């Protein structure tokens, strides 16, 4: 008479911590595949809006499956702790690949910055076409499979477009339009964060947290990357961080662009 998670899964290793929980690679005993399962470090719960778990729960019931969104399977409770079961991306974070890149002197090259952004753009389009918005796009929440395809994860900041409940994501990928509580075009904030996400993958410095370097970036000023790229590509990238607001390309207008 043990827990659903004990009886159903075999816990292989702990693989990360986030959204107020711990994630473990787990083999499901009955089908023998691998899943990433996040166990809430806290109990149900707090007040809404700024509540991760309700954002995750709402997003997982609105969205279906898409090849570039990390697939959701099941979610349940244990001793008042929430447990989320998602597909297991075996290549880890995109952030982790950039680090092992950076320490080893290498850097993602323009043919790969392009494919990183195209595939994420496809996944971002499915979210927005479901009238949802991610609100925490960064290499931490992009996952690699067969390691090749990138998928978006962490929906602790996700929300409906129509009646939004907004908790701003990571500040280093945060569009100033969101910081000033202008939710007139929320999907464009993921576009903005994606533009910076691709900047991190090209090899840019660790992004600024606040101050003038922050304020400099949100004036359309792309962060410095020790790398030269096509100014046809480089123009598209700065149209993604451009200041305010509806001008930035839609995830569909990005999933069509022959530059990519
Ligand atoms: C929600 C449950 C968040 N989430 C996912 O849905 C998935 C899916 N797939 C992964 N894959 C993954 C595999 C392996 C690693 N590591 C390998 C071992 N090294 C030493 C560290 C990295 C990482 C990721 N992960 C998923 N997560 C997930 C995993 C870890 C942290 C997070 C947070 C911080 C909540 O986003 N999410």
Tell the residue number behind the tokens 């903005």, with chain if given. Answer: 192
Q: CA 121, CA 191: separation in Å to the nearest integer?
A: 8
Co-location of 81 and 130 in the same domain: no
Q: CA 38, CA 195: separation in Å to the nearest integer?
A: 28
Q: Which atom of ligand 1 lies at the shortest distance from residue 96's CA? A: 22
Query: Can you give the residue range of the structural domain that contains 20?
Result: 1-65+71-89
Co-location of 128 and 245 in the same domain: yes
Task: Answer for the pair 168, 180: CB distance below 8 angstroms, yes or no.
Answer: no
Pocket residue to mutate for ligand 1, from 20, 36, 82, most atoms within 8 A of Cβ = 36
Query: Is 154 part of any known ligand binding site?
Result: yes
Co-location of 162 and 120 in the same domain: yes
Last residue of a domain, one of 89, 122, 144: 89
Number of domains in the chain: 2
Co-location of 59 and 133 in the same domain: no
Q: Quote the ligand 1 centre to 25 CA distance (angstroms).
A: 8
Q: Quote the ligand 1 centre to 113 CA distance (angstroms).
A: 21
- Which residues are catalytically annotated? 136
Q: Which atom of ligand 1 lies at the shortest distance from residue 140's CA? A: 36
Neighbour-count burial of 80, counting CB atoms closer than 10 A to its CB (0-12 exposed, 13-18 middle, 19+ buried): exposed
Pocket residue to mutate for ligand 1, from 15, 147, 158, most atoms within 8 A of Cβ = 15
Q: Which atom of ligand 1 lies at the shortest distance from residue 13's CA? A: 18
For residue 214, the domain's CATH number is 1.10.510.10
| Residues contacting 255, CB < 8 A, separation 6+ | 118, 121, 122, 125
Co-location of 58 and 112 in the same domain: no
For the beta carbon of residue 124, count every other beta carbon within 10 angstroms: 28
Q: Quote the ligand 1 centre to 39 CA distance (angstroms).
A: 12
Pocket residue to mutate for ligand 1, from 38, 138, 155, most atoms within 8 A of Cβ = 38
- Ligand 1 is surrounded, with C-beta below 6 A, by 15-16, 18-19, 23, 36, 38, 70, 84, 86, 88-89, 92-93, 96, 140-141, 143, 153-154
Q: CA 211, CA 99: separation in Å to the nearest integer?
A: 25
Which residue, among 50, 88, 115, 77, has the nearest Cα to 257 in the 3D structure?
115
Co-location of 247 and 162 in the same domain: yes
Co-location of 13 and 95 in the same domain: no
Query: Is 203 part of any known ligand binding site?
Result: no
Co-location of 11 and 120 in the same domain: no
Co-location of 84 and 94 in the same domain: no
For residue 30, the domain's CATH number is 3.30.200.20
Which residue, among 224, 223, 253, has the nearest Cα to 236 in the 3D structure?
253
Tell me, rounded to whole angstroms, the distance of Cα 147 from its chain centroid. 18
HEC letters along 11-66? EEEEEEEECCEEEEEEEECCCCCEEEEEEECCCCCCCCCCCHHHHHHHHHHHCCCC
Using alpha carbons only, how large is the chain's radius of gyration in Å?
18
Q: Residues 240, 245, 248, 249: what is their CA dihedral angle, to the nearest 10 degrees?
A: 130
Task: Answer for the pair 158, 132: CB distance below 8 angstroms, yes or no.
Answer: yes
Query: Is 18 part of any known ligand binding site?
Result: yes
| Maximum pairwise Cα distance, the chain | 62
Q: Which atom of ligand 1 lies at the shortest distance from residue 141's CA? A: 36
Co-location of 61 and 117 in the same domain: no
Co-location of 60 and 99 in the same domain: no
Q: CA 10, CA 257: separation in Å to the nearest integer?
A: 44
Specified resolution (Å): 2.7
């Amino acid at each position: 008479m043990a827990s659903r998670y004990e009886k159903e899964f075999l816990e292989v290793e702990k693989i990360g911590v986030g959204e107020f929980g711990t994630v473990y690679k787990c083999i499901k005993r009955l089908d023998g595949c691998v899943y990433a399962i996040k166990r809430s470090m806290k109990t149900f719960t707090e007040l809404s809006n700024e509540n991760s778990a309700l954002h995750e729960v709402y997003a997982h019931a609105v969205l279906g499956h898409h090849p570039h969104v990390v697939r959701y399977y099941s979610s349940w409770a244990e001793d008042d702790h929430m447990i989320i079961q998602n597909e297991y991306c075996n290549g880890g974070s995109l952030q982790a690949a950039i680090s092992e890149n950076t320490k080893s002197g290498n850097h993602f090259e323009e043919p790969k910055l392009k494919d990183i952004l195209l595939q994420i753009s496809l996944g971002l389009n499915y979210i927005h076409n479901s009238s949802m918005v991610h609100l925490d796009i960064k290499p931490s929440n992009i996952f690699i499979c067969h390691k090749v395809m990138y998928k978006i994860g962490d929906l602790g900041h996700a929300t409906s477009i129509n009646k939004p409940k907004v908790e701003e994501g990571d500040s280093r990928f945060l569009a100033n339009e969101i910081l000033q509580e202008d939710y007139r075009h929320l999907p464009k904030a993921d576009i903005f964060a994606l533009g910076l996400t691709i900047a991190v993958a090209a090899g840019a410095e660790s992004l600024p947290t606040n101050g003038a370097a922050w304020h400099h970036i949100r004036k359309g000023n792309f962060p410095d990357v020790p790398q030269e790229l096509s100014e046809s590509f480089s123009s598209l990238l700065k149209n993604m961080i451009q200041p305010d607001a509806e001008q930035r390309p839609s995830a569909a207008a990005l999933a069509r662009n022959t530059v990519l």
